[PDB]
Symmetry: C2
Subunit: 531 residues, 2 copies
């Protein structure tokens, strides 16, 4: 089954740090509009814009106070309508986040709900009396502490799996579901091309909210992927998504490759593709990431969803440090490792996602003062694992503040922008950006990277990650040396010819009938041929 979403390349935008069109230091919608030509030039075709809905912003915008309104600092609904029009003119698809497990406590529905024990919206959230001076149950919040928050307006507590300011919607209530489907369809009718569904795995709560088998106990057994969830998700799909030509992206949170077919299966699957995070975070050993464990994790998803679902491929996001600075080497092999990592995940079976700046090799930021950081998490290892590493402003040129703003950025631009920036990288044919553009060009010109089946080679090799892609008589070999030291590639399965080398991060060296060769640090090669 051939589809645009399987064949597309997605680009993830964190609006606040992408492009500031009005000089107030905050990226906005007009900023994005100014960069649609850039997205086209790069080659991507699906644009995922992180939360832009009205929000008190207590939870990086995932605490929505109005689903039908744009966050003031990003612009107006007119700006958004204009964005879709301009994006569609260019052949681009636009998807937004769908956060429907909860709303902000400042959402008008919760404000009415919390006012009294009997108002039309009381049942829209999860209210319960406590147990003699204590919370309704022993459930802990994913955000630490009780999942219950006492409310003095009524004497009862409301459930909040996430932040205190994120009360959970009562999916048991048909009125809630219907209001949510009307909201989804409103966006779909407005013209968006799909959504990235967030935390929907918690919409179904265990039937009497009983104590779980300890101040507060991690509560996943009472609200995550609970039986009956599929009833809500299938209804969500039939009432909304199924009525349009869109794409939905989910996450395999607490979902094994086997249970993932119920979420992303092509016939009866709530979502079209899914992200998995089992590969996130890999500390280096004495001698130097654990490539074999990476091969295993990524390979089970490749083989596991083959003809059963579709993988959403990625290395970066707004909640992670930069890939070149974590998986690669930003000190000695900056460009090489960035390109290597890019070839590695980009060419697998699935739809690749490029996070803003990943295509130019943005790295972690190392501010000396804790005050230059933002995310409350850091303030409470920052240089290496911090979320801000992916939230510093996008590096467009060597201009003041990397061309991001004419004002003062809400967070400082990484000092390496004079070198790492779009303008300079597009002039350099050996830049990380140019490598990315060639990768996008390769995948578009060779559908074997889209529908070809993945097969891992040299599984036990400690440094080389090599895999093939097969579609009929069309084959390709993606070989990557994930280490800062050379490595011998040795595989008597096929003879590699230099005329078949479609892409490499190192110059194409002469070689005929090669079954072995030394790979330079972070050397990555992509061979394509036809048997």
């Amino acid at each position: 089954k051939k589809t645009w979403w399987k064949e597309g390349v997605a680009y993830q935008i964190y609006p606040r740090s992408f492009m500031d069109a009005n000089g107030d230091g905050i990226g906005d919608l007009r900023g994005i509009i100014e960069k649609l030509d850039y997205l086209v030039e790069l080659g991507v075709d699906i644009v995922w814009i992180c939360p832009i809905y009205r929000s008190p912003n207590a939870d990086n915008g995932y605490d929505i106070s109005d689903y039908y309104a744009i966050m003031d600092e990003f612009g107006t609904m007119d700006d958004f309508d204009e964005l879709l029009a301009q994006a569609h003119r260019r052949g681009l698809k636009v998807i937004l986040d769908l956060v429907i497990n909860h709303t902000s406590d400042e959402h008008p529905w919760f404000i009415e709900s919390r006012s009294s024990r009997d108002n039309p919206k009381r049942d829209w959230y999860i209210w319960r009396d406590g147990k003699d001076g204590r919370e309704p149950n022993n459930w802990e919040s994913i955000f630490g502490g009780s999942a219950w928050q006492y409310d003095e307006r009524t004497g009862q507590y409301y459930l909040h799996i996430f932040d205190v300011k994120q009360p959970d919607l009562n999916w048991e209530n048909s009125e809630v579901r219907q209001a949510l489907y009307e909201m989804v369809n409103w966006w779909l009718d407005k013209g968006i091309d799909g959504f990235r569904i967030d935390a929907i795995s918690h919409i179904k709560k265990k039937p009497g909210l009983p104590d779980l088998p300890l101040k507060y106990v991690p509560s996943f057994a009472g609200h995550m992927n609970q039986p009956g969830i599929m009833e809500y998700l299938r209804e969500l799909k039939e009432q909304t998504f199924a009525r349009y030509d869109i794409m939905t992206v989910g996450e395999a949170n607490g979902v094994t490759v086997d249970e993932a077919e119920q979420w992303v299966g092509e016939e009866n699957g709530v979502f079209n593709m899914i992200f998995q995070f089992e590969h996130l975070g890999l500390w280096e050993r004495r001698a130097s990431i654990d490539v074999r464990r990476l091969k295993r994790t990524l390979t089970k998803w490749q083989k596991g969803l083959e003809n059963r679902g579709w993988n959403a491929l990625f290395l970066e996001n707004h909640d992670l440090p930069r890939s070149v600075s974590t998986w690669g080497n930003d000190r000695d092999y900056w460009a090489e490792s960035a390109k290597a990592l890019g070839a590695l995940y980009f060419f697998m079976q699935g739809t690749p996602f490029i996070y803003q700046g990943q295509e130019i090799g943005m790295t972690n930021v190392r501010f000396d003062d804790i005050r230059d950081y933002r995310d409350v998490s850091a303030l409470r290892i920052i240089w290496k694992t911090g979320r801000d590493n992916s939230r510093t402003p996008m590096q467009w040129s060597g201009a003041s503040n990397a061309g991001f703003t004419t004002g003062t950025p809400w967070i400082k631009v990484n000092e390496n922008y004079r070198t790492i920036n779009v303008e300079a990288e597009r002039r350099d044919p050996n830049s990380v950006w140019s490598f990315y553009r060639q990768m996008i060009q390769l995948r578009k010109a060779n559908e074997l990277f889209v529908y070809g089946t993945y097969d891992l080679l040299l599984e036990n090799h400690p440094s080389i990650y090599a895999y093939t892609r097969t579609l009929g008589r069309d084959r390709a070999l993606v070989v990557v040396n994930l280490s800062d030291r050379p490595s011998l590639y040795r595989y008597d399965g096929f003879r590699l010819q230099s005329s078949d080398l479609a892409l490499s991060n190192y110059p194409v060296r002469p070689h005929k009938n090669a079954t072995r060769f030394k790979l330079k640090p972070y050397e990555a090669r992509v061979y394509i041929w036809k048997e």
Copy 2:
């Protein structure tokens, strides 16, 4: 200087528990309108309505999100306009709370302020960088913890003397002051007759917000009654209050009787009258409140503000337990003590305030289940000192829920409403209500209780609190036996005649030339004569 505010009797309404006109269990504005005739019948003429402004209600409505709007559960601005019209038709004055030291963090001004380090409203609040990973200074919040709250949107902290959801307004900023005066005048032009000013003693912060001489240190030395505060308060008065015929009521928080003249002095005094709280809370001894300490506390204000200011007299409010249940005896001498307490504070020099239910002798509520309580404070002694004691619904009749609502009250009615309720008390000429009505009648018919000077008698007596009121040849003696056991009144200063007894809570017994007599438990007498 004779004025309506000095001659009036004020009645304090806690809107949420006064009268529910629409059956949702929450008192509202229409409820108040239905009871204006009642207020007239009782005899009061100034109506103080507690916070009714739009508020996320995180701080009992003192966290205002919109000063130009009414809290949804209380009604609409039309209801409020109608309330003023109906109140004024009846000759009643209406005052509201003025909370201008801070606003809610959900107030549109703070939402703009917190968005970026440079927006027109950034300076409207108190933002500062922290000190290497910690708060800008060591200041503690009146509400425990740091007076600073980190905000991840900018990396800076905002000052909040009160709750986290109550960021402090920057009085240093003339734009803030001007916006506040426009707001005050808007209300004054709408027709209100004055305000009860709340926490304004904190508007002036010490000039560089330095550390005070310990996790966090109580911070009163950095923001309370700080030099320069009078500059703001005098400007507030000239730009607003001085342009209308209204009354302003303040509080002597951290203000001695000597410093109080600068706040309530008649020529240059920011407020017309002031509440003092030095008398609040008096535990009983082995044998039984400390009447002498009460005599001293109340007497310094009486003599201290004589010809220098004006006292706002009271025994109850929404933050206190009921007076009969704390100062009196609600078990054996319920009615006697209620009337005694009433005569005691009511007839002093100043403007008396009657809190809703005080006039019928409402008592503390003793719910067995902590769940029937509301104020978060209780949940964190409740039967005796709880705030809810004054927030249970007003007792109008012996009807379902005391006639307060036709629905389910937001908090339960005290089980004693079948007896303690307006309907029943108005039928009973020996009820606490009837006593209150006679007290109001007495004060209106004898201006000596308004402008007459107060003088304490028998200061060293352990149980009897006796004082006189003198205006020219018109004199009165208010004598009260504050104890559940009889007491001998003995004073050779004047001979009391039974024909001069204007009011008593016990039958008028025959006596001529009495310089001594035994007073029954909680017996209170008010003699009026002309020398």
